[PDB]
Design a protein around this nucleic acid. Structure first.
Lengths: 212, 108, 212, 212, 108, 108
RNA sequence: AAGUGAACAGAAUUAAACAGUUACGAAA
């Protein structure tokens, strides 16, 4: 009737991507866009805001027939999962994300590493002159797991599109694996992989329906 | 305090200032987080933030020519040595607003 | 007869959230919605008004028999816990909250922290064009606790269903852990976690039954 | 025989509460719930009418054997402490409060505060739409002392019930700390705390026995 | 004082004012909190709020187009320098109420 | 003076007046506190309460619909300019009492 | 080195706004 379905998954980074978080806020030098980390410790964490605007953009192209310009103004079968700032029927969203923290530091530090974020040396060519602008970026590690939990809940009264919501979340997470995530994803830096996609019940009101 | 800052900041050089509000989001965060924290506890306890504030006006001042020209005119490094008391530090925090409010009065 | 049951607990924040304070009313920093804090010190305190409007909303959609349309008018099993502006039988509420203060400052500085509030860079994309309106927010700290106190009392006559009220408060606090609390927590900001949920007797007039 | 016992204490506000002042009578800022203050200066003062009515309310629900239908008519063991308008034996009570003033101004200005009272922003949800009716309230500061003096006196003849009256006043002041005081305290704004509870003799006619 | 404030405020530009009385509660919260406090103690004691009051009329004048068009017409920065006494400051606090009451008389 | 107050106040619009005597306790508090104080001292001394009395009839006129319909009909703002002497102000204080006595006779 | 101007609505509302025990006391 009214349960709290949780989708526990492990985000595995096949390639060290880069997310332009809170720049100009580092330790002794904010050079090459400092990646946002934990506000208390030093373990780099991924923001949950990047997983909401990118997943909705890549999904609003197949489950709809009208090419929209501004969000919260598209169709209706996909606007309920993220919200609508125009419709009077529903306003709140059913999908709750979470700032997943790097839980792979419990065994990676035992091998003997220096830091969690390194600086990669790159450049650019204007195709009219020689090498110029000695710029650089900051990337992360490779093959790292995260604790990403998707909290889903129904409104009991409008309980009809239960099986329809399962095929949208499963297809949205699978399509994101074949596409870059974050900024500067044109040189092959993104491409994530949702490892161990399972579901469980925490509240205790509805049986386990979906899983894969 | 606020009377001599409206004339010294206006007298610069060529118009159309390239230094917008994006490249100043690093040194303006420690000053705003100092006036509201020094009023709670004592001044002798906070020792890791006072010495760290002077480093931002030395390392980051040499990364761009549009930074040293403003520190030498506003005399920022001179006031970092005269302060020593909790009441004196509260006066320097109010002077930082003159370099931000009056900067966007003629442009942005 | 008349007892004063106190439900002492620690609200552990597994993810840094955001609460819109008094807009256009701060001190030295009033940029991107200044978060409300303490009028004397600087430690950001959580208001008690958000804990009453969110817990009642999530509970009035599972323990009811009629779709509510206005406050102080939803079912009857939960109207005596928060209040009623129409019924003449009862007016005062039996649940008393408290502005929980952050008691984690006794060991937060030992881990090496910078400040209590940071500026997170989060904007939006207009789809049809590139970056548009580069806005920003202001979040608090992560992995923090709050000394919350729940003042509970009975009116002598409300004694033949004391055990019925314990299962409602316990189910309401556990359900709040799997949902964002505060404001604009759709991007994975809220999600609280009540730690050390115990009960005690201060006035001393009723026995101790629950504990965990 | 006839003594003047004074129960001097310091009311420390552990949580900022709200007191509804004289609306539509102040200056141009008569909105945002105007809080009553000093008619000459700006130091916020707490009225004594909210203390005598709240202490008698919580006392007339645990030390009685009949539901109070109308004021000035409930039991008899507590009617002589606050007064009785329908009794013919006794009229004047034995408990006199005082409009306490904020005496914490000796060190409040050293910390550098903006104003004595701030404006808190709140709203409500119609359970069918988003934000509606952006209201606003006004609160006070936190951790502020108040010079509270309890004028206690006996009528000579009532000498054999002195120790019995001390346990009633102490139970009323301790129970008041676990309840909101003033107004709009259902969300967690009241909850006072009597600090430095002592007694002294001004007229000098009765010995000093009680203290805490 | 109050006679010339009904004609200068009405003479503006395009109708339908998009600015309400709630979005200007920042620069108007300190003027109302200063008149009731200056009548108690002296004027030479409160020196940290006088300099901070002028900053509100400059920092908020470059973040909204509905602010610069009102300060230059009503001449707010000119009266901030002539004041110097406690009795003179009481006159400027009463003139600020004319820009709020008469602003909502024709609309909101 | 008091003869036209029975016809101008009665001729309104829809019956059942929703405005009582408690919501109008703000603008009617300074009128009664002025007639009993202007007779002691001179009129040229009280220069702060005269300008503030006109503000109450402007700020409260744009918030409630039951205020603008009464000021325009009774011509309250028109009599505020003709007064200039202490004897003339005594006549305006008596005209305000006529709009309250006849208002509670037909309803409340 | 590289256009960066948080955008758009509601601006505090619906109850209740003097209830009662009652009046020259003992001299010319």
């Amino acid at each position: 009737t009214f349960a709290k379905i949780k989708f526990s998954a492990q985000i595995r980074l096949e390639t060290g991507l880069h997310i332009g978080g809170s720049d100009a806020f580092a330790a002794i030098g904010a050079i090459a866009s400092p990646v946002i980390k934990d506000p208390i410790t030093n373990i780099p964490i991924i923001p949950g805001s990047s997983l909401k605007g990118k997943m909705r953009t890549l999904l609003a192209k197949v489950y709809n027939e009208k090419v929209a310009e501004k969000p919260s103004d598209d169709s209706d079968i996909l606007s309920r999962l993220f919200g609508n700032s125009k419709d009077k029927r529903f306003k709140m969203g059913r999908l709750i994300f979470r700032d997943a923290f790097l839980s792979n530091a419990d065994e990676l530090d035992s091998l003997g590493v220096r830091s969690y974020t390194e600086v990669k040396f790159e450049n650019t060519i204007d195709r009219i002159t020689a090498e110029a602008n000695p710029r650089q970026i900051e990337r992360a590690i490779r093959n790292s797991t995260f604790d990403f939990e998707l909290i889903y809940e129904i409104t009991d009264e409008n309980e009809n599109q239960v099986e329809e919501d399962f095929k949208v979340i499963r297809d949205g997470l699978k399509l994101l694996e074949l596409d870059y995530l974050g900024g500067s994803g044109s040189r092959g830096y993104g491409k994530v992989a949702f490892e161990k996609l399972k579901a469980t019940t925490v509240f205790g009101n509805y049986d386990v329906k979906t899983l894969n | 305090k606020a009377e001599r800052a409206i004339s010294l900041l206006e007298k610069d050089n060529k118009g159309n200032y390239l230094l917008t509000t994006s490249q100043i989001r690093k040194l303006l965060s420690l000053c705003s987080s100092l006036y509201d924290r020094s009023k709670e506890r004592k001044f002798d306890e906070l020792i890791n933030d006072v010495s760290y504030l002077r480093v931002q006006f030395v390392y980051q001042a040499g990364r761009e020519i549009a930074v040293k020209d403003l520190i030498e005119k506003a005399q920022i490094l001179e006031a970092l040595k005269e302060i020593k008391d909790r009441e004196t530090l509260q006066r320097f925090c109010r002077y930082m607003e003159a370099l931000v409010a009056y900067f966007k009065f003629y442009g942005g």
